[PDB]
Structures are given as C-alpha cells and as structure tokens.
Design a protein around this motif. Sequence first.
Motif, PDB file in Angstrom:
ATOM      1  N   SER A   1      -2.048   3.219  -8.318  1.00 21.61           N
ATOM      2  CA  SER A   1      -2.270   4.666  -8.394  1.00 21.61           C
ATOM      3  C   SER A   1      -3.580   5.101  -9.044  1.00 21.61           C
ATOM      4  O   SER A   1      -4.139   6.130  -8.664  1.00 21.61           O
ATOM      5  CB  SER A   1      -1.095   5.365  -9.081  1.00 21.61           C
ATOM      6  OG  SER A   1      -0.911   4.881 -10.396  1.00 21.61           O
ATOM      7  N   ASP A   2      -4.066   4.332 -10.018  1.00 18.38           N
ATOM      8  CA  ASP A   2      -5.324   4.675 -10.684  1.00 18.38           C
ATOM      9  C   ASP A   2      -6.457   4.710  -9.664  1.00 18.38           C
ATOM     10  O   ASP A   2      -7.474   5.374  -9.879  1.00 18.38           O
ATOM     11  CB  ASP A   2      -5.669   3.689 -11.811  1.00 18.38           C
ATOM     12  CG  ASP A   2      -6.054   2.307 -11.299  1.00 18.38           C
ATOM     13  OD1 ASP A   2      -5.161   1.620 -10.793  1.00 18.38           O
ATOM     14  OD2 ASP A   2      -7.229   1.901 -11.420  1.00 18.38           O
ATOM     15  N   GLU A   3      -6.277   3.984  -8.562  1.00 18.65           N
ATOM     16  CA  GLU A   3      -7.273   3.937  -7.500  1.00 18.65           C
ATOM     17  C   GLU A   3      -7.273   5.242  -6.722  1.00 18.65           C
ATOM     18  O   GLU A   3      -8.319   5.695  -6.254  1.00 18.65           O
ATOM     19  CB  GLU A   3      -6.996   2.771  -6.550  1.00 18.65           C
ATOM     20  CG  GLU A   3      -7.152   1.415  -7.197  1.00 18.65           C
ATOM     21  CD  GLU A   3      -6.970   0.269  -6.226  1.00 18.65           C
ATOM     22  OE1 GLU A   3      -5.897   0.174  -5.583  1.00 18.65           O
ATOM     23  OE2 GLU A   3      -7.908  -0.550  -6.120  1.00 18.65           O
ATOM     24  N   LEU A   4      -6.088   5.827  -6.569  1.00 17.68           N
ATOM     25  CA  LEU A   4      -5.950   7.093  -5.864  1.00 17.68           C
ATOM     26  C   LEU A   4      -6.545   8.215  -6.716  1.00 17.68           C
ATOM     27  O   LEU A   4      -7.185   9.122  -6.193  1.00 17.68           O
ATOM     28  CB  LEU A   4      -4.476   7.375  -5.546  1.00 17.68           C
ATOM     29  CG  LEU A   4      -4.161   8.671  -4.788  1.00 17.68           C
ATOM     30  CD1 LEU A   4      -4.714   8.625  -3.372  1.00 17.68           C
ATOM     31  CD2 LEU A   4      -2.665   8.889  -4.763  1.00 17.68           C
ATOM     32  N   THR A   5      -6.358   8.130  -8.030  1.00  8.69           N
ATOM     33  CA  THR A   5      -6.890   9.132  -8.941  1.00  8.69           C
ATOM     34  C   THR A   5      -8.410   9.147  -8.889  1.00  8.69           C
ATOM     35  O   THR A   5      -9.019  10.212  -8.872  1.00  8.69           O
ATOM     36  CB  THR A   5      -6.411   8.881 -10.377  1.00  8.69           C
ATOM     37  OG1 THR A   5      -4.980   8.993 -10.420  1.00  8.69           O
ATOM     38  CG2 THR A   5      -7.018   9.890 -11.342  1.00  8.69           C
ATOM     39  N   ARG A   6      -9.027   7.969  -8.853  1.00  6.04           N
ATOM     40  CA  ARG A   6     -10.488   7.884  -8.776  1.00  6.04           C
ATOM     41  C   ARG A   6     -10.941   8.405  -7.409  1.00  6.04           C
ATOM     42  O   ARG A   6     -11.819   9.265  -7.314  1.00  6.04           O
ATOM     43  CB  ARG A   6     -10.974   6.433  -8.972  1.00  6.04           C
ATOM     44  CG  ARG A   6     -12.501   6.276  -8.945  1.00  6.04           C
ATOM     45  CD  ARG A   6     -12.955   4.848  -9.241  1.00  6.04           C
ATOM     46  NE  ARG A   6     -12.550   3.907  -8.201  1.00  6.04           N
ATOM     47  CZ  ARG A   6     -12.944   2.636  -8.132  1.00  6.04           C
ATOM     48  NH1 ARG A   6     -13.762   2.128  -9.044  1.00  6.04           N
ATOM     49  NH2 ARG A   6     -12.527   1.872  -7.135  1.00  6.04           N
TER      50      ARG A   6
ATOM     51  N   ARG B   1       0.838  -1.197   0.000  1.00  6.57           N
ATOM     52  CA  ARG B   1       0.000   0.000   0.000  1.00  6.57           C
ATOM     53  C   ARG B   1       0.878   1.254   0.000  1.00  6.57           C
ATOM     54  O   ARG B   1       1.063   1.897   1.037  1.00  6.57           O
ATOM     55  CB  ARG B   1      -0.920  -0.004   1.222  1.00  6.57           C
ATOM     56  CG  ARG B   1      -1.899  -1.158   1.272  1.00  6.57           C
ATOM     57  CD  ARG B   1      -3.271  -0.714   0.829  1.00  6.57           C
ATOM     58  NE  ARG B   1      -4.276  -1.713   1.167  1.00  6.57           N
ATOM     59  CZ  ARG B   1      -5.577  -1.566   0.941  1.00  6.57           C
ATOM     60  NH1 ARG B   1      -6.035  -0.458   0.375  1.00  6.57           N
ATOM     61  NH2 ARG B   1      -6.424  -2.534   1.275  1.00  6.57           N
ATOM     62  N   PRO B   2       1.446   1.605  -1.168  1.00  5.31           N
ATOM     63  CA  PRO B   2       2.322   2.771  -1.357  1.00  5.31           C
ATOM     64  C   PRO B   2       1.665   4.136  -1.613  1.00  5.31           C
ATOM     65  O   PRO B   2       2.207   5.173  -1.214  1.00  5.31           O
ATOM     66  CB  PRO B   2       3.177   2.345  -2.548  1.00  5.31           C
ATOM     67  CG  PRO B   2       2.193   1.587  -3.384  1.00  5.31           C
ATOM     68  CD  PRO B   2       1.450   0.746  -2.371  1.00  5.31           C
TER      69      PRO B   2
END
Length: 85
Positions: free
Chosen positions: A17-22, A1-2
């Motif tokens: 990272s795409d999860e953080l963007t959403r 989990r970075p």
Amino acid sequence: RPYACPVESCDRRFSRSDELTRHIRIHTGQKPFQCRICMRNFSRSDHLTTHIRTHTGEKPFACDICGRKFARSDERKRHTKIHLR
DNA sequence: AGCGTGGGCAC
DNA sequence: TGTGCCCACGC
Ligand SMILES: [Zn+2]
Ligand SMILES: [Zn+2]
Ligand SMILES: [Zn+2]
C-alpha cells in the motif's frame, strides 16, 4: 497485486500500500520537497537530492575504466558500456 | 549528455 | 511512514 489505483482513468496496481500512497501523488500533483537553491518543487526526496547536484556539481560516481564522474549511479552505469565493443 | 521522475523495494 | 538506493524510460 491487491492495491489498485482509485482514479478511474488510472489502471495501475501495486503490491504494498505504501506504493499506492506514493503513486497517488502523480494524480494529486503533490510535491512536498523543495530545492532551497532554485525553489523548484519535487514529488520525492531522493529526486531532490540528485537534482541539487545539478547546482553544486557534486559527482560521487566514477567510471571504473576511464574515471569519468557522474552525479547519479545510473548515468555512470549507462556510460560504462561505451568502453565495450 | 543532462536529468526529470515513476516503479520495486530494502531498512 | 520516511529515507534512500537501484533500475528503466523518456526527451
Ligand atoms: Zn494512478
Ligand atoms: Zn534546484
Ligand atoms: Zn568510462
């Protein structure tokens, strides 16, 4: 989990990272998907698709036991268990 | 029930 | 990045 959420008050963490963007959209309030029927805005395309079914009445998910139809598979999943006891 | 909506993740 | 399910929680 970075990948951690940059917002100070938010302490959420994600794998890709795409999860953080959403996720970041919950903080920016961005809702790029609009329902051409009622003009409401949504944060995600998949939630808009299911939302629209509330207008059209489309219900693609039928219960295997009684045949009752639902707009979402989770509504059907939650329903199917009432047949047990 | 009706259904918004975030999280995990496949393609 | 975009599209789209499943899954789970909340009111
Ligand atoms: Zn956050
Ligand atoms: Zn609408
Ligand atoms: Zn049923």
